[PDB]
Amino acid sequence: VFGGDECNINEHRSLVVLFNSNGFLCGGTLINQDWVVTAAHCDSNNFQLLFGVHSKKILNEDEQTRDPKEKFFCPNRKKDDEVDKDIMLIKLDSSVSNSEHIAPLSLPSSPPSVGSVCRIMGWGKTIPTKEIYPDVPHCANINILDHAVCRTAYSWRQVANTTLCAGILQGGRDTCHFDSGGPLICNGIFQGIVSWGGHPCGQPGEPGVYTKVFDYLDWIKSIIAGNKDATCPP
Amino acid sequence: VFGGDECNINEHRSLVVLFNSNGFLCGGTLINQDWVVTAAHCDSNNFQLLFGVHSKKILNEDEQTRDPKEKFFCPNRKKDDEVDKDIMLIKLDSSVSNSEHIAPLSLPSSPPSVGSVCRIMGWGKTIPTKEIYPDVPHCANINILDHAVCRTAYSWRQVANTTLCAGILQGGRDTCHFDSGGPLICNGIFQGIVSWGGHPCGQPGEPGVYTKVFDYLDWIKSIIAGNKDATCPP
Numbered sequence: 001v002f003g004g005d006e007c008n009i010n011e012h013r014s015l016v017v018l019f020n021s022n023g024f025l026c027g028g029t030l031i032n033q034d035w036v037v038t039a040a041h042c043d044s045n046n047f048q049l050l051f052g053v054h055s056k057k058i059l060n061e062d063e064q065t066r067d068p069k070e071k072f073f074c075p076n077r078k079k080d081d082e083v084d085k086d087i088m089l090i091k092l093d094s095s096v097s098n099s100e101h102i103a104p105l106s107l108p109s110s111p112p113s114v115g116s117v118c119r120i121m122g123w124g125k126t127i128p129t130k131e132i133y134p135d136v137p138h139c140a141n142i143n144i145l146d147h148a149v150c151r152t153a154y155s156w157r158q159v160a161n162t163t164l165c166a167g168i169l170q171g172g173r174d175t176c177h178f179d180s181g182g183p184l185i186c187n188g189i190f191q192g193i194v195s196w197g198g199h200p201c202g203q204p205g206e207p208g209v210y211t212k213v214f215d216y217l218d219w220i221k222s223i224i225a226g227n228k229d230a231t232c233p234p
Numbered sequence: 235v236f237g238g239d240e241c242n243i244n245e246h247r248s249l250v251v252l253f254n255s256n257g258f259l260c261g262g263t264l265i266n267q268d269w270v271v272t273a274a275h276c277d278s279n280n281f282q283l284l285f286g287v288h289s290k291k292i293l294n295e296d297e298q299t300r301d302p303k304e305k306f307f308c309p310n311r312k313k314d315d316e317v318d319k320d321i322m323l324i325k326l327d328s329s330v331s332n333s334e335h336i337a338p339l340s341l342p343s344s345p346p347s348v349g350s351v352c353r354i355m356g357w358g359k360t361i362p363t364k365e366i367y368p369d370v371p372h373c374a375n376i377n378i379l380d381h382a383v384c385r386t387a388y389s390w391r392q393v394a395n396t397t398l399c400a401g402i403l404q405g406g407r408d409t410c411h412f413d414s415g416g417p418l419i420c421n422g423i424f425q426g427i428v429s430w431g432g433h434p435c436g437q438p439g440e441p442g443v444y445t446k447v448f449d450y451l452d453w454i455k456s457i458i459a460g461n462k463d464a465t466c467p468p
């Protein structure tokens with residue numbers, strides 16, 4: 001996260017870490033005691049999920065680890081476009097219970113209004129060009145922008161409507177590489193999933209695009225209730 | 235460990251890992267649910283202890299992390315001698331319960347005999363010259379040798395009587411740097427603590443010198459029971 005500060009140790013109790021033998025992959029969001037939401041582009045053959053993490057060097061006495069038992073993607077997702085319908089549900093091999101540094105995030109009831117202030121968080125790049133990563137996750141506030149700003153900022157490709165356009169108009173704060181899958185939270189509600197953006201991040205006039213969780217509510221609940229044939233919003 | 239193979243995932247449940255911000259420090263041994271025994275030269279201002287660990291890449295789901303609440307050393311220990319009375323007792327800040335990959339090891343009732351076959355284990359060097367470290371702990375069987383082999387082999391310093399001389403005579407098997415603090419187990423009994431040896435491990439004729447647990451039984455029991463003045467055997 002570019003333009004932020006170290007997150008408070010208690011302000012990110014729902015942030016999950018996806019990693020494998022090759023290291024850190026992405027972030028994720030725990031929505032209930034058995035499921036994790038993250039980005040579809042973060043998928044890997046094998047990986048594990050780590051809960052309750054703050055510092056990577058100085059561990060928390062309450063971290064939990066689980067393996068993905070099931071993974072779900074939109075049935076109607078475009079094969080070639082890696083960020084098309086960037087959402088993946090992970091059914092844990094074993095339930096995770098609340099603790100001092102672990103807790104789920106509630107799904108939204110309604111979508112965020114243009115201009116609302118939201119929180120982004122992750123262990124991704126903090127310097128736009130350098131491959132320097134934090135030890136603790138960084139937090140920064142950004143605003144919900146008019147979707148047209150993004151549509152026009154990235155005219156060479158199509159910015160789906162099932163996405164939120166967020167950031168700071170003059171740049172300086174934005175999610176970056178390895179921040180993917182993490183939550184965009186507005187007023188304590190789970191509103192978006194970090195998906196993609198500019199090169200590098202934080203440039204003025206190039207906001208980030210987040211999967212709009214709300215548009216996928218029916219999908220999420222259907223998959224979680226047991227219906228696996230649930231198709232996503234086009 | 236030089237000269238062995240990867241340990242079976244279930245044959246090292248008492249093996250603890252001491253680490254800090256600078257990384258890995260040493261091995262250790264869980265003797266009951268509240269105490270860990272290790273070498274005194276493994277001390278560091280700040281460190282933590284990890285239980286139920288095997289592979290550093292693929293984590294077990296039952297791992298536990300605790301912090302050192304109290305540390306204890308022999309009152310009558312030599313100031314400038316890093317390996318004199320090489321034993322340290324650590325009281326955990328919170329109890330550790332048994333699980334698939336965590337279980338304590340029992341204190342000895344009698345000292346091992348010369349010629350006994352014992353298991354050594356740890357994440358220390360596997361090739362004497364190369365600064366290459368295992369991902370999973372390596373185990374190997376060595377024999378308890380006549381204490382005099384050590385006495386003469388290391389005629390350039392003095393080998394205490396409160397230690398076990400163990401290894402293979404022609405070399406090719408020994409503990410190495412970063413293997414310290416781990417346990418020497420003979421017939422399932424906790425008999426020694428990895429302390430020191432020659433440069434580099436495995437040289438023919440230069441066995442490993444381990445802290446003889448049996449000789450400290452009283453100090454250990456007195457310390458754990460409450461007598462913080464208990465003195466060690468000279």
Ligand SMILES: *C[C@@](*)(O)[C@H](CCCNC(N)=[NH2+])NC(=O)CNC(=O)[C@@H](N)CCC(=O)O
Nearest residue numbers: 083175176177178179180196197198201208
């Ligand atoms: C998977 C995740 O780690 C990244 C997140 C990048 C976020 N970038 C900004 N500026 N907020 N996403 C990608 O690697 C995917 N990239 C693309 O799909 C490109 N078309 C856009 C480049 C980009 O995401 O920055």
Ligand SMILES: *C[C@@](*)(O)[C@H](CCCNC(N)=[NH2+])NC(=O)CNC(=O)[C@@H](N)CCC(=O)O
Nearest residue numbers: 409410411412413414429430431432435442
């Ligand atoms: C702290 C612990 O990891 C090591 C273990 C070395 C074991 N070596 C062999 N060959 N089994 N201990 C030390 O680094 C302490 N070293 C000494 O006290 C030196 N007098 C000997 C160096 C040595 O142990 O190789």
